[PDB]
Amino acid sequence: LYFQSMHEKVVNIQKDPGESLGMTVAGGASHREWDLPIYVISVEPGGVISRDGRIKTGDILLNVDGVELTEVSRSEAVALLKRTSSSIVLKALEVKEGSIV
Amino acid sequence: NLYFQSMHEKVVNIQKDPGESLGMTVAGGASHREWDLPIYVISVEPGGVISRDGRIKTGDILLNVDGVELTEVSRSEAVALLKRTSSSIVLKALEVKEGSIV
Ligand code: NA
Numbered sequence: 001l002y003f004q005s006m007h008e009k010v011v012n013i014q015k016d017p018g019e020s021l022g023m024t025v026a027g028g029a030s031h032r033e034w035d036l037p038i039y040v041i042s043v044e045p046g047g048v049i050s051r052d053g054r055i056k057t058g059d060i061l062l063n064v065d066g067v068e069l070t071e072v073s074r075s076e077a078v079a080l081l082k083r084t085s086s087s088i089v090l091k092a093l094e095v096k097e098g099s100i101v
Numbered sequence: 102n103l104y105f106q107s108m109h110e111k112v113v114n115i116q117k118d119p120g121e122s123l124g125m126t127v128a129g130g131a132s133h134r135e136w137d138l139p140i141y142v143i144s145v146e147p148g149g150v151i152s153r154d155g156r157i158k159t160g161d162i163l164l165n166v167d168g169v170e171l172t173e174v175s176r177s178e179a180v181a182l183l184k185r186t187s188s189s190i191v192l193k194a195l196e197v198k199e200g201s202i203v
Contacts, residue, residue, distance in 0.1 A: 002177065004128055006133060021203045024200040026200030027106075034139075039200075058143075058160060060136070095128050095143065096128075097128065098128035098144070099127050099180045100126050101123045
């Protein structure tokens with residue numbers, strides 16, 4: 001039996017403008033062999049993302065402020081995440097379960 | 102000021118008992134909307150084969166098992182390759198070493 005469970009979240013975060021999100025992201029479509037997701041690879045303890053609690057290391061970022069991240073470059077995705085703003089809407093994916101091997 | 106990232110491949114030859122599992126859990130190998138999730142390591146069982154070996158980590162994307170490129174086979178075939186009864190398994194994985202802080 002193959003199990004897998006997905007939870008796609010809409011995460012509304014209010015912050016100070018010029019406050020960073022406090023997470024580290026990697027992935028995207030920059031390289032020849034891959035169109036990878038944008039992964040959250042670290043979260044800074046006590047930062048915006050950390051205090052919010054909904055997005056954690058291992059989650060995938062799907063959409064930032066209405067823009068689906070498949071439609072823009074990794075550079076542009078980072079640009080969207082870095083936009084000066086006091087609120088940001090992120091859609092993220094949390095994957096659970098899997099096949100034990 | 103810099104928003105650099107880096108990812109690196111690694112080849113891991115593991116010797117094990119034919120009766121023992123790898124001691125990890127894999128997910129992905131399926132699409133979500135317009136996203137194709139690669140097969141990756143979602144969990145590692147403390148003290149199992151993969152844990153004791155120490156080279157493959159949670160989050161590693163699995164590229165190739167025993168010569169078979171996983172993008173070229175079904176998800177279930179990927180899982181079957183990993184579960185093969187054998188005393189040695191060769192894995193090629195892709196690890197994100199560095200990302201962009203936002
Ligand atoms: Na690409």
